[PDB]
Amino acid sequence: SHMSNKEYRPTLAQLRTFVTIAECKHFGTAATKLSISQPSLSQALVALETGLGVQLIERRKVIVTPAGEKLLPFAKSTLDAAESFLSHAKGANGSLTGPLTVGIIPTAAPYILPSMLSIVDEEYPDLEPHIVEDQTKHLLALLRDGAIDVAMMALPSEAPGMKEIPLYDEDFIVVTASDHPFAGRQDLELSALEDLDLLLLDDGHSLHDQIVDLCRRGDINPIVTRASSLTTVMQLVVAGLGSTLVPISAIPWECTRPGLATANFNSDVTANRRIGLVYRSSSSRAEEFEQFALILQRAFQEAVALAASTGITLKQNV
Amino acid sequence: KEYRPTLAQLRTFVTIAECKHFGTAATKLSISQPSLSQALVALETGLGVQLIERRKVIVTPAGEKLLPFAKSTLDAAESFLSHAKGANGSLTGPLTVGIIPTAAPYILPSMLSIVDEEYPDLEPHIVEDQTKHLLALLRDGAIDVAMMALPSEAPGMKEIPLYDEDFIVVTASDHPFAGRQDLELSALEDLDLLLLDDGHSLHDQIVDLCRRGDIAVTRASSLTTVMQLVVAGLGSTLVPISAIPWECTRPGLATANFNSDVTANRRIGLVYRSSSSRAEEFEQFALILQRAFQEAVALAASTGITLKQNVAV
Amino acid sequence: NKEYRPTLAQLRTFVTIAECKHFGTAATKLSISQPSLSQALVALETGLGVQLIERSTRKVIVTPAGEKLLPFAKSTLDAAESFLSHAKGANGSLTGPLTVGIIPTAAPYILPSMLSIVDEEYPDLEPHIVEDQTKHLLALLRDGAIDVAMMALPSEAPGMKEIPLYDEDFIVVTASDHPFAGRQDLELSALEDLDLLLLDDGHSLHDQIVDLCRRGDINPAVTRASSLTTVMQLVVAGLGSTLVPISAIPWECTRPGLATANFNSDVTANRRIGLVYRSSSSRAEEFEQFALILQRAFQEAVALAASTGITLKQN
Amino acid sequence: KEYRPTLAQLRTFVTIAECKHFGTAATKLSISQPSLSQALVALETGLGVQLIERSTRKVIVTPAGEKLLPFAKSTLDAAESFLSHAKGANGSLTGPLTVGIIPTAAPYILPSMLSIVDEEYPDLEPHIVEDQTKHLLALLRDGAIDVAMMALPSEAPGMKEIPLYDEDFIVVTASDHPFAGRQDLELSALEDLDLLLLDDGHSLHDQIVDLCRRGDVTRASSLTTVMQLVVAGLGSTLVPISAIPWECTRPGLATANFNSDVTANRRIGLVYRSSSSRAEEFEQFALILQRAFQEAVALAASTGITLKQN
Ligand code: NA
């Protein structure tokens, strides 16, 4: 590498050739991957190797040299930085264009995603959404570190550096085995919770805590079976091991399987969660996140309509 | 000459400590409330130690310290009885079963129904949690057995192999692999795989499949969330076949499989502490789980979706 | 019939015969008659449906079935004897088994004094020590596999009670030739000038040092260790600097090639250590007594640190 | 297919943002003003985004340009780092090397390894990851470390193993223990000890358990914690001989050994991906580790404590 060409600067195209060959271990496969001829591929590689004064590949199969193996991570970092520049460029210019990483709590995500993603695909076609489904405490940590842009969770977040956009109040519904005496009742009082063996998600889920708070309002303790997802809880409910409460957006996805019935509290009882969009108060993207909020409010209305389409009677309020 | 506690007295103490109500404790043991109180007071007087204080019943500091010794005695006595009976004793009483989240929802309906009908004195308790947590609960005695993928790679434990469960590829309806039954492992290169996060053994298994085939931001904690992403055209995934009737029938999904010569499956097993003396019972429980899986596989076949074909050796 | 459950008295008879190898000696050992012994044995054999001891002879022969069941009978009797023996102690404070969980960056430094205090002042305590990271200690506490846990507060674990023990200062540790060597007046912003080598992110000490940097770091990695002793070797080799709790000083910071420094009197750079237990426990009073032991043990660990001559943080 | 920026275009953008003038930017890059303008317009057209504004006697970056700048910068910095490392890439054991090491070897081997490296391989930039075996093998599979020092066999398909050395164990007891100072123990002596072990995640745990099987709950994460338990009379243990000067010289401990005919050791090796082309360098690194171990063993011998004879 004293035979280095001093003014020589590698191009991204040359680096792509190197990385591709290192990964494919065949010139022909590498060339087809890059949509170029084998002579073009070899010219790019030889230009790189001559420019650097370092042999990167030993020409029956392609083997990376010791030098090539040591430089491969630096080449990859360059290509990754360039891809990140290009992706960001799509977002810099407009509102809701380019990457947006959205954190969502597990008891909202699967039920809001179909409508949110369909609206985005049709109305914001340059948006590149990335979805991180995780519990609240992890989403707040990812928000603080910048690993996600916004988080959809229950409010209040009680997280000091954050702004909150209220989206909607989502009612709960009681879910029981088909043969349970509350099946189909629409007039329960809060005190009816005393008569249920509640099966709850573990303490890491905000839905656990919300159900426990509901029991408190009614002066009842909510309290060995631990479940990590609503679909597992539904199987336990079908099997007669207990009852639960789910958000109404879950209805079409969780509560239509055979062996379940539903019930609601009366009009005077409040049994809901407040969902909101949370982001770093230092962010300059308030305007975009406010537009995203409108999408989520529309998506929820569609999820609620999907719930009503099942025929399952929903909570009435006032 | 001097006072020696009976097992009956110890059962009364332990049951009261767990139930926190005399009436519930008495019904649990199929005795009257006076009989329960007589046994407890005989124990307390014989020992000269108050174990339970006067509306729910609360264990005293002394009772809390003696509780684990009472439990050990009852557990040793149960083990004597179970070994004397041998094979015919069968499964009775509490059994806490840990199960991984990508098996639990799909195996539970048939396992629980078999147990309810054919082992009516079995009292199953289900802990659905990720593998690392299940192994820690096993080590601390908080669960009895754990259903998970093998190898567990936990020195300290025994493994009963249950079955091999095939994967299936799940794509959007309009994806170009949709419906193919002849994929090679290298086809994984051409998919944007959406995986559960790194805490799930299914993540690691799919990654290993890619490595055998010589092959970051979007992550989910549940298969149902992944299916929504797949329907929306954000990527493809692999699921265990037992998931098919629960996750893969929603509109906008299609399936595909690898060819007959490709192995793309996970080995599920029942894991327990090698210090346990309950091998024979856990072996019977294993048979239940193997039957439950066969029923889950039949449910998958009932959908009409073509399943992986394997060289049947 | 199906409902039969052996009694301890029946098991004692079986085990004693198997061990004494003579029915008369066995009967006298249990202070019962030979007819009573035989009645208990045959009640056991009939209830089980298994012959345990052969029958037409004064010699004792355990059957194959009896030989296989003997160890299970023995375990039961040993567990029952242990219950009875511990009942004598159960009204005593800090008597019998106590399993104590401790975080790895406190355990090795608090244990010598703690264990010596326990040995001298609570001689009927049978301590068992589980050294593990915080998240694992909280899981063991929830499952009942440990009784109490020594870790940094707040635990943020619902269902736990916390007894605050003490605030333990950190100290900055550098290579001998580092320009901060011996300084006692650092500001928090001095952290910007260090290449910090930390334990991996499973350790609460990692997180605490990161939080310290955020305080003073307005707005805004490969080398990692699982133990402070490994970090110290990296520091001696000039690969970076670190912070350790003061109780670590005599064990980690006296090896050749290290120096120390402290932040000035106005800076807070410490961790709060506490004793955590299940709020459902009835043993508050004992755990409170145990807390006093740990507070004394820490004072002794701090005196050991002062004995090295290394200057400690002033507050 | 679609437009991809070149590094040349990014250099032009960044330099204009910094110089605030086209002519000065062009001179900074040793190109003509027309070349500079061509590169900028190609970038702006390719992206569909205006990055620079004419700006009242000087050149200003637009809102879009200001947001894209730091990152154009990241790309250029990554490219410079590639180029700078290329100068070093041909030399053996030069540049970054990330080395994984198991926790019951790391603290005892590192002083000597790091000193040898500092003096004799001054262009090597070591990074050390101390973690348990299973984690080291996962990091090696993902490429997050280059080599791993651990006990053999690794039982990891796709890895190559360079055997380094056999390291003897030594028995550690309280000073007043009846085996204290014995040099003739048989493996069956383990039956008579209350062994205090590291938790299950440590290969030393498993090795001691296997030793007990050949001869036929208090748990800690570090050997230093185990030593405190041993001093307090709660049990005995076994440690690798490289640990002796660091762990076993405190008042209240004594040592013992198995007899000459007994094998009680661990085989340490250097593990790496068998797809690597760096065999020759890793073989040289292995020699460093074998030398480091010899120095650790000499440190153990320097204490005066009697070591296992074979
Ligand atoms: Na005292």
Experimental method: X-ray
Beta bridge partners of D271: D148, D161
Q: Which CATH class is domain D12-88?
A: mainly alpha
What is the SS3 assignment for chain B?
A: CCCCCCHHHHHHHHHHHHHCCHHHHHHHCCCCHHHHHHHHHHHHHHHCCCCEECCCCEECHHHHHHHHHHHHHHHHHHHHHHHHHCCCCCCCEEEEEEECCCCHHHHHHHHHHHHHHHCCCEEEEEEECCHHHHHHHHHHCCCCEEEEECCCCCCCEEEEEEEEEEEEEEEECCCCCCCCCCECHHHHHHCCECCECCCCHHHHHHHHHHHHCCCCCCEECCHHHHHHHHHCCCCEEEEEHHHHHHHCCCCCEEEECECCCCCCEEEEEEEEECCCCCHHHHHHHHHHHHHHHHHHHHHHHHCCCCCCCCCCC
Contact D61, D12 (CB under 8 A): no
A162-177 and A244-247 beta bridge pairing:
antiparallel
Best CA proximity match to C300, nearest among C247, C245, C262, C244:
C247
Chains C–D, number of C-beta pairs less than 8 Å apart: 103
D124-130 and B93-99 beta bridge pairing:
unpaired
Find the C121 Cα to ligand 1 centroid distance in Å: 5
Q: Among C143, C226, C228, which would you mutate to test the D interface (most chain D Cβ atoms within 10 Å of its Cβ)?
A: C226
- How is domain C167-270 classified at the CATH fold level? D-Maltodextrin-Binding Protein; domain 2 (3.40.190)
Q: Using CB atoms, which residue from D68, D86, D280 is nearest to A54?
A: D86
- How is domain B7-85 classified at the CATH fold level? Arc Repressor Mutant, subunit A (1.10.10)
Q: Which two tokens stand for residue A209?
A: 């805590």
Q: Which CATH class is domain A12-92?
A: mainly alpha
Q: Which residues of A touch B220 (CB under 8 A)?
A: 109, 131, 133
In angstroms, the separation between the Cα of residue B133 and the nearest Cα of chain C is 9
Any chains having at least 3 CB pairs less than 8 A from chain C are B, D
Asked if the C-beta of B245 comes within 8 angstroms of chain A's C-beta atoms, the answer is no
Find the B65 Cα to ligand 1 centroid distance in Å: 20
Asked if the C-beta of D231 comes within 8 angstroms of chain C's C-beta atoms, the answer is yes
Residue C9: closest CA among chain B residues belongs to which residue?
Answer: B6
Place of tokens 């049990």: D235
- Select from 3.60.15.10, 3.40.190.10, 3.40.50.300, 1.10.645.10 the CATH code of A168-273: 3.40.190.10
Q: Which CATH class is domain B163-266+303-303?
A: alpha beta
Best CA proximity match to A133, nearest among A148, A154, A115:
A148
In angstroms, the separation between the Cα of residue B122 and the nearest Cα of chain D is 30
Residue C225: closest CA among chain D residues belongs to which residue?
Answer: D130
Any chains having at least 3 CB pairs less than 8 A from chain A are B, D
Contact A308, A262 (CB under 8 A): no
Asked if the C-beta of D210 comes within 8 angstroms of chain B's C-beta atoms, the answer is no
In angstroms, the separation between the Cα of residue D153 and the nearest Cα of chain B is 15
Residue A131: closest CA among chain B residues belongs to which residue?
Answer: B218
Q: Which residues of B touch D200 (CB under 8 A)?
A: 139, 154-156
Question: Using the beta-carbon criterion (under 8 Å), do A231 and B220 form an inter-chain contact?
Answer: no
Question: Using the beta-carbon criterion (under 8 Å), do D4 and A86 form an inter-chain contact?
Answer: yes
Q: What is the DSSP string of D16-84?
A: HHHHSSHHHHHHHTT--HHHHHHHHHHHHHHHT---EE--TTS-EE-HHHHHHHHHHHHHHHHHHHHHH
Place of tokens 């010569």: B261
Contact D106, D204 (CB under 8 A): no
Asked if the C-beta of C96 comes within 8 angstroms of chain B's C-beta atoms, the answer is yes
CA A185 to chain CA centroid, Å, is 35
Residues 6+ apart with CB under 8 A from C201: C207
Resolution in A: 2.0
- How is domain C8-89 classified at the CATH fold level? Arc Repressor Mutant, subunit A (1.10.10)
Q: Using CB atoms, which residue from B139, B155, B211 is nearest to D206?
A: B155
Q: Among D128, D142, D295, which would you mutate to test the C interface (most chain C Cβ atoms within 10 Å of its Cβ)?
A: D128
Amino acid making up residue A60: R
- How is domain D165-265 classified at the CATH fold level? D-Maltodextrin-Binding Protein; domain 2 (3.40.190)
Distance from C-alpha of B298 to C-alpha of B306, rounded to nearest angstrom? 12
Residue D3: closest CA among chain A residues belongs to which residue?
Answer: A86
Q: Using CB atoms, which residue from A114, A225, A227 is nearest to B231?
A: A114
Q: Which two tokens stand for residue A99?
A: 């990457």
Place of tokens 């052996």: C6
Distance from C-alpha of B186 to C-alpha of B211, rounded to nearest angstrom? 10
What is the SS3 assignment for chain C?
A: CCCCCCCHHHHHHHHHHHHHCCHHHHHHHCCCCHHHHHHHHHHHHHHHCCCCECCCCCCCCECHHHHHHHHHHHHHHHHHHHHHHHHHHCCCCCCEEEEEEECCCCHHHHHHHHHHHHHHHCCCEEEEEEECCHHHHHHHHHHCCCCEEEEECCCCCCCEEEEEEEEEEEEEEEECCCCCCCCCCECHHHHHHCCECCECCCCHHHHHHHHHHHHHCCCCCCCEECCHHHHHHHHHCCCCEEEEEHHHHHHHCCCCCEEEECECCCCCCEEEEEEEEECCCCCHHHHHHHHHHHHHHHHHHHHHHHHCCCCCCCC
Find the C251 Cα to ligand 1 centroid distance in Å: 27
In angstroms, the separation between the Cα of residue C15 and the nearest Cα of chain B is 12
Q: DSSP assignment, residue A313?
A: P
